[PDB]
Design a binder for this molecule. Structure first.
Ligand SMILES: NC(=O)c1ccc[n+]([C@@H]2O[C@H](COP(=O)([O-])OP(=O)(O)OC[C@H]3O[C@@H](n4cnc5c(N)ncnc54)[C@H](OP(=O)(O)O)[C@@H]3O)[C@@H](O)[C@H]2O)c1
Ligand SMILES: Cc1cc2nc3c(=O)[nH]c(=O)nc-3n(C[C@H](O)[C@H](O)[C@H](O)COP(=O)(O)O)c2cc1C
Lengths: 161, 168
């Protein structure tokens, strides 16, 4: 089995957020997808080792920020290469509080979505949370960043509108 | 709540296949994603009213063909009918059969993945099938077709994969 075949699967790039016990958590995730339309349900798959996973497990709510094409790599690293409980990821970033109580990061976001968890599907190393959308807003007219784009950025390439 | 925000989520375009009661089934789908790496697990979300949904639930296996950017619309159309015979879907289509028994469509595919269902997550109108990948292969050196590209091209417009430029 050639693991490189899985590189061919397409994804967006997002920040998945939640808050539990006054602790704001956020992580980068590429595994975010809409599952149904009646009602609108969005799934996020988070590693059980993540602080954001535990915040979602406890609070039963999560936010999703869809990242824009021009999101800086340091912003991606702020959320994707350290733990929320060990580094204040939200200090220095613009965000607001959703109707569910989750922090919705507006900085570099084309849109934000907040959802309440209605089902958890354990898949081993990760938990697939199924959330029913409670609110969603489009914030910018910018192009979205894809996971494939991010891999081109990793190679030193930079987006040019 | 602005529904347009949900259209900002990215997806690929795939043919999800299965075989049940000696009949090959296939359906276009955009909701296919890798859940885990240890072991590799792939999720596919299918509407309960689709024949492929039932084929996967019965057989416990599925295949995924990742479509190339240049896939003709007529080919995609073969796998998008609510009701169509096996011959209507597969006649003249290049495919091979994996150890799980599912037909792996290789035509217009950049890669194919074969999986055995290990868990089902019922989400109401759809079932999210969690499959443990048993095989996977890269077949071509071509760009993938994203769901957004598909929608653009369908309307005779240039793909995003062509409107965005990366500077080395
Ligand atoms: N939990 C999840 O669903 C999930 C999904 C993705 C990543 N992650 C985690 O996120 C962090 C950063 O991951 P990452 O995305 O930077 O990579 P990574 O998963 O750590 O991949 C390591 C290397 O594999 C190659 N590679 C992997 N995926 C590729 C792709 N889609 N396209 C092209 N090359 C690919 C590249 O090799 P070369 O650079 O040598 O070409 C890349 O540097 C890591 O801690 C990783 O474990 C978690
Ligand atoms: C490009 C990229 C994509 C990622 N995708 C996911 C994902 O889909 N699911 C996941 O659980 N972690 C994913 N991660 C890893 C988390 O963002 C990372 O482990 C983060 O440090 C977790 O933070 P937390 O402990 O504060 O939740 C990704 C990281 C990067 C850089």
């Amino acid at each position: 089995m050639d693991v490189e075949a899985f590189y061919k699967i397409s994804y967006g790039l997002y920040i998945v957020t939640s808050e539990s016990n006054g602790r704001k958590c956020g992580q980068i995730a590429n595994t975010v997808f809409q599952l149904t339309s009646k009602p609108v349900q969005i799934a996020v798959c988070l590693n059980k080792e993540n602080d954001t996973h535990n915040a979602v497990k406890e609070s039963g709510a999560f936010g999703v920020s869809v990242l824009e094409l021009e999101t800086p790599m340091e912003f991606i690293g702020r959320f994707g290469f350290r733990k929320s409980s060990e580094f204040e990821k939200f200090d220095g970033v613009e965000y607001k509080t959703g109707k569910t109580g989750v922090p919705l990061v507006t900085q570099h976001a084309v849109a934000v979505i907040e959802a309440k968890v209605v089902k958890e599907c354990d898949v081993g190393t990760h938990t697939l949370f199924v959330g029913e959308a409670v609110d969603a807003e489009v914030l910018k007219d910018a192009e979205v960043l894809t996971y494939a784009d991010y891999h081109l950025m990793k190679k030193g390439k930079t987006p040019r509108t």
